[PDB]
């Protein structure tokens, strides 16, 4: 692998036959600088310092169009060779040390994602969770696989347990990584 | 059933070393998880990584205007964007939260950049073993986390301290624990 | 502000 003080992607261009769907992101030292919501035609920043930059969402749609063409050409070249489904590695951990009655964020790290199409839902005590749930985009890896992180802003209780339900084609049954204080 | 999917990836990768001095551009052309062609600024031309690479690599090598416009991105994309990084992402200094909780673990919470140095001291004395440090945990919200477990024996009259060094701190952050 | 890498087109 290439050894460097800082590594950056300007940017991560992604396109797939499922949907079809696209993704445009910029990365700096493994962190997502921003993404472009192709459906909404909007640039979404992930650092308040970066938010004042003017990145036109058109420039993302414009590059993905070349990827759309290139994929068609390589489907014809590979004699239509589909992507292999990978088994993802799920890890659940808190943002800060666990303290009862103090605000903390639960982090679900879904590593080794391929193809980049996955469902990451949260469960508290079996029922589903919609409130306080946020996630990142598909972050690039050197092995050209992905990883996505899902957050959960919560207050921890003595009897409150939490589960991270992950649905992927590489999995026969939805994977559940349990968490408890 | 397994849904049929064909993936294509393009990555414009810049590698920065010793600040502005060492700069490298690598544009990777990937089909599924197979990188078939890449341009490397250090190499000077597009290259075929796999047998699916020559129809792309040769085609882009035949035209001087394709080579010139690609070769230009070492300055128009890497060096250009690094000047923006120096003002934004490279200035980002988030100081860590050091806590000791029970054998004994030093929880170093939410910091930026990644560079860190956690050390346990027995009584103004180091402690090399038994130290079980977790890898550098990436939280994805531009903060890092690192947990260091220490196997101790609680003995009379010893103070256990966790020494943590980071570029956001002018002096190391020290947190102590007693039996 | 930020600049991007433009992907080359296949045949």
């Amino acid at each position: 692998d290439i050894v460097a003080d800082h590594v950056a992607s300007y940017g991560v261009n992604l396109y797939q036959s499922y949907g079809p769907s696209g993704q445009y992101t910029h990365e700096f030292d493994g962190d997502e600088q921003f993404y472009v919501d192709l459906g909404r035609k909007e640039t979404v920043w992930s650092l308040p310092v970066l938010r004042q930059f003017r990145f036109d969402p058109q420039f993302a749609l414009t590059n993905i169009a070349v990827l759309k063409h290139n994929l068609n050409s390589l489907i014809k070249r590979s004699n239509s060779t589909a992507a292999t489904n990978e088994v993802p590695e799920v890890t659940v951990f808190s943002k800060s040390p666990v303290t009862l009655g103090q605000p903390n964020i639960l982090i679900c790290l879904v590593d080794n994602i391929f193809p980049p199409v996955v469902n990451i839902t949260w469960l508290s005590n079996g029922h589903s969770v919609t409130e306080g749930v946020s996630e990142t985009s598909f972050l690039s890896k050197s092995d050209h696989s992905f990883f996505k992180i899902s957050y959960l802003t919560l207050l921890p209780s003595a009897e409150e347990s939490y589960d991270c339900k992950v649905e992927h084609w590489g999995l026969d049954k939805p994977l559940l990584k349990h968490w408890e204080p | 059933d397994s849904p049929e999917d064909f993936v294509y990836q393009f990555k414009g990768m810049c590698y920065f070393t010793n600040g502005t001095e060492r700069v490298r551009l690598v544009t990777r052309y990937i089909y599924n998880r197979e990188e078939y062609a890449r341009f490397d600024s250090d190499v000077g031309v597009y290259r075929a990584v796999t047998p699916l690479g020559p129809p792309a690599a040769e085609y882009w090598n035949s035209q001087k205007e394709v080579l010139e416009r690609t070769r230009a991105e070492l300055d128009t994309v890497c060096r250009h964007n690094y000047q923006l990084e120096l003002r934004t992402t490279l200035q980002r200094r988030v100081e860590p939260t050091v806590t000791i909780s029970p054998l004994l673990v030093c929880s170093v919470t939410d910091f930026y950049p990644a560079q860190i140095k956690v050390r346990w001291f027995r009584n103004d004395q180091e402690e090399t073993t038994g130290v079980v440090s977790t890898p550098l945990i990436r939280n994805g919200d531009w903060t890092f986390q690192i947990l260091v477990m220490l196997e101790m024996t609680p003995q009379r009259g010893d103070v256990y301290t966790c020494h943590v060094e980071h570029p956001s701190l002018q002096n190391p952050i020290i947190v102590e624990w007693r039996a | 502000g930020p600049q991007q890498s433009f992907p080359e087109q296949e045949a």
Partner: T-cell receptor
Amino acid sequence: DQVTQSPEALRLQEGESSSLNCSYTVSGLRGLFWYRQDPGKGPEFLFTLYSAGEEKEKERLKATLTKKESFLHITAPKPEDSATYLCAVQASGGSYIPTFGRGTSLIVHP
Amino acid sequence: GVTQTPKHLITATGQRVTLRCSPRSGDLSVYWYQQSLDQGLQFLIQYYNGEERAKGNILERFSAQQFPDLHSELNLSSLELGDSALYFCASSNRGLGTDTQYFGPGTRLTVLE
């Protein structure tokens, strides 16, 4: 986001070397293009410059790019070089749509 | 490289004309330009791989299209005396920031009363 060419028109004598200016105030430039256009004919491509400091050459022509402008140095011009020299810019400011200048009408007297 | 048909076009006001342009082999982007004495080289519309990419200060009467063979058609309806101009076509590889435009010989339109 504008591009400006000076002079609007130029009158030169055979051999009298001069320079055509192309000033731009657009942001995030990714290409500067110089063209040669004859009456009724389509614009003939000359040079591309991708960044400031670049310099390209084609016989008696020399195109240079700087952070503020681009110069098309025409050395020892002949009456054959009588055309309208067009300048265009492709930048983030102008959504990369080519913004052309009003050209410099060149006329070289024998 | 870039070809254009017809070369000359003499027509009347109110008529409809269709302009054709075949781009460079390998180029997937086509641009349309109107050149007149008082307005200069003005961008009309752009295409990429058969889909609309960009719209300029084009009129409602003016319409365009890029076929699967990647050639383009600029249709000009309810023609006015002012429409008398040089209509150039341009071709680009991917239609991105670093792509060089290559022009065609251009159709020359003359609209008379």
